[PDB]
Amino acid sequence: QTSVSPSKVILPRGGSVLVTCSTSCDQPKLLGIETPLPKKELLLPGNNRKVYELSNVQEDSQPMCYSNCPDGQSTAKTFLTVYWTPERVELAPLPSWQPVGKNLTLRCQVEGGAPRANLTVVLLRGEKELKREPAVGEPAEVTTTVLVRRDHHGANFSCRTELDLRPQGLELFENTSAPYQLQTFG
Amino acid sequence: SNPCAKPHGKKLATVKQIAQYYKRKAYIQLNERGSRSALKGDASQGQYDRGGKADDFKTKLCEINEKHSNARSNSLNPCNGKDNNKVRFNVGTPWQSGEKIATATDVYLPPRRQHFCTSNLEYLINGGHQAILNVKNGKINHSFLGDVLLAAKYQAQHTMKDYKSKNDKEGICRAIRYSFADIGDIIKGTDLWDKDGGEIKTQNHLVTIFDKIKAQLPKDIKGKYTGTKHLELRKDWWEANRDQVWKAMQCGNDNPCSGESDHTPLHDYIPQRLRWMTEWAEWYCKEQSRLYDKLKVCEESGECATCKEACEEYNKEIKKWEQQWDAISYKYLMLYAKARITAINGGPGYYNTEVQEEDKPVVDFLYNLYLQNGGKKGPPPDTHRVKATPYSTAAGYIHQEAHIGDCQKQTQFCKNKNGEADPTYAFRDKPHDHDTACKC
Ligand SMILES: O=P(O)(O)O[C@H]1[C@@H](OP(=O)(O)O)[C@@H](OP(=O)(O)O)[C@@H](OP(=O)(O)O)[C@@H](OP(=O)(O)O)[C@H]1OP(=O)(O)O
Ligand SMILES: *[C@@H]1O[C@H](CO)[C@@H](O[C@@H]2O[C@H](CO)[C@@H](O)[C@H](O)[C@H]2NC(C)=O)[C@H](O)[C@H]1NC(C)=O
Ligand SMILES: *[C@@H]1O[C@H](CO)[C@@H](O)[C@H](O)[C@H]1NC(C)=O
Ligand SMILES: *[C@@H]1O[C@H](CO)[C@@H](O)[C@H](O)[C@H]1NC(C)=O
The missing domain is CATH 2.60.40.10 (Immunoglobulins)
Incomplete structure (x- = not known):
């Protein structure tokens, strides 16, 4: 149900990444990302797609894209590998x-x-x-x-x-x- | 000042300044590989199966025609079967898009590009005929430049013949510069219109022709090129021949077009997506003007019925273009964010951005555009820790580079002055001076 692009990222520490949380549904109730990293959501026309800019990535994190859909609540993870x-x-x-x-x-x-x-x-x-x-x-x-x-x-x-x-x-x-x-x- | 950029005191760097940075990098690469002498062709030294005398390319370059070619005879001339209805330069011609046009998403095809004089290049290898591949050893490169110069001359002359208002000398040159750059992307293998069958065949032939060009290169030079599609070789072939291609495009012009750098354009150094986005804004402003001119009948309910139908025709048509502009804006926004993030991370070598292969030079161009406009480079301080912008939006880019002079009253490409929309907004439902007029 919930997809994420990129699925795997290699970035320098203190660095930033652009993450896209997407869902198979057309009109979902909830759509977001669970991460303690500073985020700036890039405003797009899509109601089933959300773009986030994650900054100050100090250590290996797993930002979790979440979506509450009529078929059921689903999660997707991206693997940030810091260097x-x-x-x-x-x-x-x-x-x-x-x-x-x-x-x-x-x-x-x-x-x-x-x-x-x-x-x-x-x-x-x-x-x-x-x-x-x-x-x-x-x-x-x-x-x-x-x-x-x-x-x-x-x-x-x-x-x-x-x-x-x-x-x-x-x-x-x-x-x-x-x-x-x-x-x-x- | 820029009406779509937030208040700034940064030292501005124009797209042309970045194109010059890429122009410098292109000749540094060609000279360091030492392939210029081997890649620079001389069309007078080629063979032409269509009957044209090879020497004409040296003696009388502007006199060359369909006979100075190795294309199959069914391809009568480079412009054969291209724009029969003559829509290319018509003010309201819609721009095609989608999966049927390009692999790269949110790409809008210019009608000028759709009806392009490259028929000879398409029919160089067709149903048994492959004259270009059967030429005497050491003449494939020379013969190939001949067809490239012929396609270029015919493309420029087709533009001079069918351009909307012949008196618009700058407008013809604008289209000839766009055509030159588009020829370059076709030759380099970076052209975005890759879903059209004829264009697929043209590219397949270019690879086959470059298989032979590479094979006839010296041992030391041949080794410096790797890739199935010969993308690096085709990049360097273009740099070695682009000056000749440009001169061929001035043929038959009473008002020859100027070259802003070394008597050649810089456009062929700006990635195609950005160029096509610029052209889109310019041809929308012509349509916006045409639609605004239809509201002249609305000089004043009552007998204002002719105005009501003119106000709604403006609304329905403008919204058709706004939908294309939104897709263009939101794609550019994503690409610029990717470029800015690359810079925050320390550029290439420090960070490999997730992006379509087609958008890699776009992200690279916007990355240098960000840095030269005051953007902070280098990896973050935590990477190598020791123990004890006006171009940020497609609207901002357009107000800096595109010809918006044709847009009447509705000129601002952004809904809000820096960040309900402004009365000067380009894609507004009705013009601000016609607010009381449309409500009769
Ligand atoms: O030629 P190699 O197969 O590399 O033999 C080396 C070479 O010394 P020889 O040329 O005298 O054989 C080394 O010395 P360098 O050429 O790098 O200066 C090394 O010595 P290091 O301690 O400096 O690494 C060591 O020689 P040694 O035993 O004097 O330390 C060893 O030769 P051996 O086969 O005699 O061990
Ligand atoms: C760290 O080293 C390992 C081992 O060389 C790298 O893993 C290889 O990566 C490539 C490309 O992703 C794969 O095709 C190989 O199969 C991997 N090999 C093994 C044994 O795992 C890894 O990519 C290196 N890390 C970085 C950041 O470059
Ligand atoms: C390691 O190398 C980088 C780049 O040369 C440098 O900035 C950094 O300070 C170095 N760190 C140490 C501990 O030497
Ligand atoms: C060792 O380094 C010093 C400089 O720090 C230099 O003067 C000297 O020549 C080097 N030794 C050798 C054997 O090269």
């Missing part, structure tokens, strides 16, 4: 001067970033990938062990996040931490 880059990408404070032969642990904490299924964390030495793992847990912690060598004197270590939203036709959102320049001795 946002990590709030904090940082390598754990490590002293620059490290001796040759040391087993050096590089720890990167990643605070937030969603959808997590599309967010992966990368540890690099320059542009060379050391460890690439999907971001799991809050905060997502990625670790690698580097054996300090003379060759690494001056080398920059960094932590990068990749929110790849290309499968659903969007951009790959990259984020880099503050670099750590290794300085060797001995």
Whole structure:
């Protein structure tokens, strides 16, 4: 009885969406949308169709289109999937001067970033990938062990996040931490 | 100032300014792909099965005729069987619409577009005949431009011959600019009148012809184009040949039409839906004027019977057009909202709007139109959070871009001045100066 367009939405958080609640009836008694999101109804000639502009979408919501029809009351749902880059990408404070032969642990904490299924964390030495793992847990912690060598004197270590939203036709959102320049001795 | 826009102090950006932004983006794309030399045809280097001498396209372009073609002989000339009754430029001609006209909803077909001189293009591939496909290697592109230039010349000359009042030099040019742009959309594969059988066949042939054009492109160039209907290739072919097409449309004109950008129009950069909406308002204002002129008999119950029938004829006819305008307004309102939401979300790459494939350039054009008129771009602040307009309505758009000079007394395309309707409302039951007159 009750239909909704779009049925599934991918949008940035704090963003807006245009939702259309529609019913199979010609003259229904009730027609609206149940959602705690700020809404502005776009005035149209249709009495069985209603357009809504949902703003400030901060988290995953399921706005429910409702309609009381003579055949019976019916509901329809749209699945809003919100996305946002990590709030904090940082390598754990490590002293620059490290001796040759040391087993050096590089720890990167990643605070937030969603959808997590599309967010992966990368540890690099320059542009060379050391460890690439999907971001799991809050905060997502990625670790690698580097054996300090003379060759690494001056080398920059960094932590990068990749929110790849290309499968659903969007951009790959990259984020880099503050670099750590290794300085060797001995 | 705009009588359908809420009080604003924003720096205005016109549709032509957006069309120039799209003009710049079109030549940047063609030059970056390096396909111009390969896509720009020379019709004098083509082959023409109808008998016309190829060289004529170089020596005497304005002298070309039905013989300078590869269309089947049953297609006598590009204008053959087009507008026999001569209704195209008649003031009250109704605009057809619905599922029988377009896939895209709330599309109203201009009679000028309905009776278009593209018969040669329709009969390039028909019942065994496919002369354009049987030409010597390296001449398909050159021969194709020939038929495109012929269709363009004949379309412009048909306009000069049958336009309502030959003295209206600006009116002829307005229609020639609309025709040029419409030719472009046909060639690009973005034409909205896609439900007509003849138009379906024309598009099927365009794909077959572009299958061969693409096949004859160099290895490095061929790879830059992907798509079954060759939409990106046809977009770049148009950009590479549109200057020649425009010059062919000035043939036989004692009063040649000016080109507002690089001696060519900008109209072919405005999406078809918006262009057709503009033309609709202009041809409604001609009908509104015709209907208002019928109320001249109402110079004064009694002998005002001739006025009573004139006031009601005005009412029944105006409401027929208002119903079309409402569908146009409410569609534009939806498309502009979609464009504004895209901008709020951070534009493309940040948000993919749910819209008909046909309305994607319309939502894209209105998106840039929103941004350049003071609209706020970029994703919301919560997207990349760190740890510690007068064109908003179809009425507003019309008062900015459309020729409304023909509308008498009832001129305002919006019911209310900014947001019972105003006495200057275009689609009012009767003209405001005839209120006491219609009530005799
Ligand atoms: O050529 P690869 O198959 O990539 O071999 C690598 C390469 O070192 P080699 O060229 O000496 O074989 C790496 O070093 P880079 O080329 O990236 O500088 C790496 O070293 P990292 O610790 O810098 O990642 C490591 O060499 P090593 O054992 O010195 O660490 C490893 O070579 P191995 O096969 O000898 O392990
Ligand atoms: C997050 O990653 C998953 C897995 O790659 C994406 O899911 C795919 O999406 C496409 C298009 O919607 C489907 O055709 C595939 O079948 C999906 N694969 C799987 C294994 O589910 C998902 O779209 C990504 N999210 C975003 C926002 O791009
Ligand atoms: C992530 O990247 C975006 C875009 O480059 C930027 O605006 C944002 O501040 C970055 N956030 C962090 C935590 O680096
Ligand atoms: C590391 O980064 C610094 C700038 O922060 C740069 O001067 C230096 O050359 C980089 N090291 C290497 C090995 O490129």
